[PDB]
């Protein structure tokens, strides 16, 4: 069977990355692919070592999938030379420096931009001499997911001078860290009305700090987040979390459909390869959140991956990759 090894950067207990893995496994089973997922447990050096040893060992996989980063990815690209293994870079774009090797990315910048626009929309009027104070919690500073989401935030801020970013801190995707930072920041900047977070874990942490200070998430203080953890989905449904961008946890599954087809020789143009650019993020509605909450990591089982394959498909067929395939 076509074999793929994916180097997962998260912890084996990290909600988002586990959901990403579970969706891929559902795709692997349906597509008849031999998939192995190696967790870095949040230390990029482990990803590098896992790749280094894979290239030096026997029984190499047909494909090696990895998340792009500015320090480890380049080294893995150089080490892969002459390995015979096909590489697939996901989640963020290949750089000019880095430029068979394909890639697949989502729309992180749009998510960062839309979160602020959505928060501003829900907050509603109040202007005329009054500023709208904002706190921002980003992820790991050196990661493209954080950089791209922040770029989107910066674009929205440039369009809304009334919004005053009092401070942007790096919560490193960590809930307790954001919680600790929020305890201090929300006390220092009591006029804060908006809290933009690059992920849901951090939003939930900041929300707890907010409740402890007497603030009311969803009413007098609005929060945004990215991902679809059970707690975040429930908070969105309850109205405590105001905006939740979700959908990118499905990227790995779509990637396997693409690799499955590449192995069959169904590649080239038309289908969108070898560097796919997808729009996966959606600001979830309570109804959609309810569906995702009920299904959890079993959501992939309702997706007909083999049906997404271009195999035996008429032309003009473009992959319909999206969250809608899960909510039908």
163 beta partners: 132
The candidate with the shortest Cα–Cα distance to 232, out of 292, 172, 300, is: 292
Structural domain harbouring 53: 1-107+247-328
Claim to verify: residue 145 and residue 39 sit in the same structural domain: no
Claim to verify: residue 218 and residue 231 sit in the same structural domain: yes
DSSP one-letter code for 301: G
Q: How far apart, in whole angstroms, are the C-alpha atoms of residue 217 and residue 257? A: 40
DSSP one-letter code for 172: T
88 beta partners: 65, 102
The candidate with the shortest Cα–Cα distance to 257, out of 324, 320, 299, 302, is: 320
Q: How far apart, in whole angstroms, are the C-alpha atoms of residue 31 and residue 258? A: 11
Claim to verify: residue 133 and residue 207 sit in the same structural domain: yes
Q: How far apart, in whole angstroms, are the C-alpha atoms of residue 29 and residue 112? A: 33
97 burial (CB, 10 Å; 0-12 / 13-18 / 19+) is exposed
Query: Which of 212, 246, 280 marks a domain boundary?
Result: 246
The candidate with the shortest Cα–Cα distance to 275, out of 144, 94, 125, is: 94
Claim to verify: residue 141 and residue 214 sit in the same structural domain: yes
User: How is the chain split among helix, strand and coil, in percent rounded to 5?
Assistant: 45, 20, 35
Claim to verify: residue 114 and residue 240 sit in the same structural domain: yes
To 10 degrees, what angle do helices 72-80 and 44-56 make?
0
Extract the tokens encoding 245. 């961008």
Claim to verify: residue 113 and residue 239 sit in the same structural domain: yes
Q: How far apart, in whole angstroms, are the C-alpha atoms of residue 113 and residue 96? A: 24
Number of domains comprising the chain:
2
CATH code of the domain in which 151 resides: 3.40.50.2300
Q: How crowded is residue 208: how many other Cβ atoms within 10 Å of its Cβ?
A: 15
Q: How far is CA 61 from each of CA 47, 222, 238, rounded to the nearest angstrom? A: 16, 46, 45
DSSP one-letter code for 26: H
Claim to verify: residue 200 and residue 297 sit in the same structural domain: no
Query: Which of 215, 246, 277 marks a domain boundary?
Result: 246
The candidate with the shortest Cα–Cα distance to 67, out of 142, 2, 3, is: 142
13 burial (CB, 10 Å; 0-12 / 13-18 / 19+) is exposed
55 burial (CB, 10 Å; 0-12 / 13-18 / 19+) is middle
Query: Which of 217, 246, 275 marks a domain boundary?
Result: 246
List all residues 6 or more positions away from 132 whose beta carbon is below 8 Å from its beta carbon: 120, 123, 126, 160, 162, 163, 164, 193, 194
Extract the tokens encoding 324. 């809608």
Claim to verify: residue 240 and residue 254 sit in the same structural domain: no
Q: How far apart, in whole angstroms, are the C-alpha atoms of residue 250 and residue 326? A: 9
The candidate with the shortest Cα–Cα distance to 326, out of 22, 90, 23, 8, is: 23
Claim to verify: residue 130 and residue 241 sit in the same structural domain: yes
DSSP string covering 217-273 = BTTTBEEEEES--HHHHHHHHHTSS-EEEE-GGGHHHHHHHHHHHHHTT--STTTT-
Give a three-class secondary structure readout of 305-324.
HHHHCCCCCCCCCCCCCCCH
The candidate with the shortest Cα–Cα distance to 35, out of 229, 323, 257, is: 257
Q: How far is CA 277 from each of CA 68, 89, 91, 152, rounded to the nearest angstrom? A: 14, 12, 9, 17
């Amino acid at each position: 069977l076509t074999s793929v090894v994916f180097l997962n950067p998260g912890n084996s207990t990290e909600t988002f990355w586990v959901s990403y893995s579970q969706f891929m496994q559902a795709a692997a089973r349906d597509l008849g692919l031999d998939l192995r997922i190696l967790y870095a447990e949040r230390d990029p050096q482990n990803t590098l070592q896992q790749a280094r040893e894979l290239f030096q060992g026997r029984d190499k996989p047909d494909y090696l999938m990895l998340v792009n980063e500015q320090y480890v990815a380049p080294q893995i690209l150089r080490l892969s030379q002459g390995s015979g293994i096909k590489l697939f870079i996901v989640n963020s774009p290949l750089t000019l420096d880095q430029r068979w090797i394909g890639s697949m990315v989502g729309d992180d910048e749009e998510a960062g931009y839309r979160m602020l626009k959505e928060l501003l929309h829900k907050l509603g009027p109040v202007p005329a001499g009054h500023g709208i104070e904002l706190l921002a919690f980003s992820g790991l500073k050196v990661t493209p997911a954080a950089q791209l989401r922040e770029r989107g935030l910066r674009r929205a801020l440039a369009e809304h001078p009334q919004v005053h970013l009092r401070q942007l801190v790096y919560g490193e995707w960590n809930r307790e860290r954001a919680y600790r930072q929020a305890q201090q920041l929300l006390k220092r900047y009591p006029k804060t009305q908006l809290v933009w977070s690059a992920n849901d874990e951090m939003a939930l942490g900041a929300m707890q700090a907010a409740r402890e200070l007497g603030r009311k998430p969803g009413t007098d203080l609005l929060f945004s987040g990215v991902n679809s953890s059970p707690e975040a989905l429930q908070a969105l449904i309850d109205g405590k979390l105001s905006v939740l961008e979700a959908g990118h946890f499905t990227l790995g599954g779509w990637a396997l459909v693409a690799l499955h087809d590449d192995a069959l020789g169904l590649d080239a143009r038309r289908l969108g390869g070898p560097d796919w650019q997808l729009s996966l993020f959606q600001a979830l509605t309570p109804a959609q959140a309810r569906q995702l909450l009920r299904l959890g990591d079993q959501v992939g089982t309702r997706v007909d991956f083999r049906g997404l394959s271009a195999q035996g498909k008429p032309d003009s067929y473009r992959y319909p990759f999206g969250l809608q395939l899960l909510l039908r």
